[PDB]
Write a protein that binds this ligand. Structure first.
Ligand code: JRC
Ligand code: CL
Ligand code: MG
Ligand code: ZN
Length: 313
């Protein structure tokens, strides 16, 4: 109980910033995550023995894929940690608990393929969950790990608090389905502008938490340029493997997934920053002003991709 996690001074300072990179030392990521739960939530909110056992079961259930891996899980949780810490009073004790866990678990047992590829392959998961296929699986896996003996980090919550947290986590994980992000952000844009946004309206909280999840999930675009650029290699390694599998089914994949159209990556990054990332962090900054450093970092990286196109790198 009087056992803090401490980090070396550089990490202790930099972990508080939106652009923190969790480093190449895998064995420190669990400690980094417990550090964030302790500072974000209290040293009390989970029994260490149970938390540490949930963390290692979650790690074990991420696969060795280029991008949708254990590093991604902890990176996304850290972004959520930065948002919660910069918006201290806006969130309930239960939301802070559930959202860090939601982020850690949001891509559990990802195989490196899109919902589209599951459906065209006719994977069993596409029969079981007709929309947000992988995201319903991720939530299902989360619940299965919570039910292993010694793994219920939420044991000390009341029955109603327990149903509340698992409902926060389910919505948070489903919101990471980027097909749902576009409509969710439009509605938030409309509600912010017409001044109808009400953080006491549960369905309004839900939409805002959904935009936070999209923001945390896309956070490679808010890092220092070299992190952003090297993460993009990992993203394309999955995209192009999926394209290869599309060609095996006799289907010409979208250019995003076609390693033959590697040349046009820079222009594809502009499209993504303009269509997805910039609007996402803009609406998030409007709703939560202290998350502006994500929008500012995203704009800097857009400007770096523009320089790649102009042959300056
Ligand atoms: C939703 C999935 C799950 C994994 C993250 N994700 C993302 O979308 C995602 C998350 N972070 N980042 C940086 C991306 C990303 O790079 N996204 C995109 C989006 C559209 N594109 C089109 C083209 C293109 C390339 C060559 C030629 C022509 C086009 N490249 C892209 C890249
Ligand atoms: Cl604090
Ligand atoms: Mg996902
Ligand atoms: Zn993700």
């Amino acid at each position: 109980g009087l056992m803090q996690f401490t980090l070396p001074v550089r990490l202790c300072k930099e972990i508080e910033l939106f652009h923190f990179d969790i480093g190449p030392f895998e064995n420190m990521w669990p400690g980094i995550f417990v550090y964030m739960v302790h500072r974000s939530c209290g040293t009390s909110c989970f029994e260490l023995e149970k938390l540490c056992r949930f963390i290692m079961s979650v790690k074990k259930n991420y696969r060795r894929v280029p991008y949708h891996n254990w590093k991604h899980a902890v990176t996304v949780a850290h972004c959520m940690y930065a948002i919660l810490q910069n918006n201290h009073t806006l969130f309930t004790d239960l939301e802070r608990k559930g959202l860090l866990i939601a982020c850690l678990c949001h891509d559990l047992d990802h195989r490196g393929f899109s919902n589209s590829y599951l459906q065209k392959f006719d994977h069993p998961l596409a029969a079981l969950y007709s929309t947000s296929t992988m995201e319903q699986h991720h939530f299902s896996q989360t619940v299965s790990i919570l039910q292993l003996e010694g793994h219920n980090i939420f044991s000390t919550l009341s029955s109603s608090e327990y149903e509340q947290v698992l409902e926060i986590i389910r919505k948070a994980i489903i919101a990471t389905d980027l097909a749902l992000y576009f409509g969710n952000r439009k509605q938030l844009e409309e509600m912010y502008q017409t001044g109808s946004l009400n953080l006491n309206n549960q369905s309004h909280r839900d939409r805002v938490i959904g935009l936070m999840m999209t923001a945390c999930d896309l956070c490679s675009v808010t890092k220092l340029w070299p992190v952003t650029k090297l993460t993009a290699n990992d993203i394309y390694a999955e995209f192009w493997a999926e394209g290869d599998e599309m060609k095996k089914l006799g289907i010409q994949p979208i250019p995003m997934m076609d390693r033959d159209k590697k040349d046009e990556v820079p222009q594809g990054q502009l499209g993504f920053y303009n269509a997805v990332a910039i609007p996402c962090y803009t609406t998030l900054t409007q709703i939560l002003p202290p998350t502006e450093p994500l929008l500012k970092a995203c704009r800097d990286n857009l400007s770096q991709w523009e320089k790649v196109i102009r042959g300056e790198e």
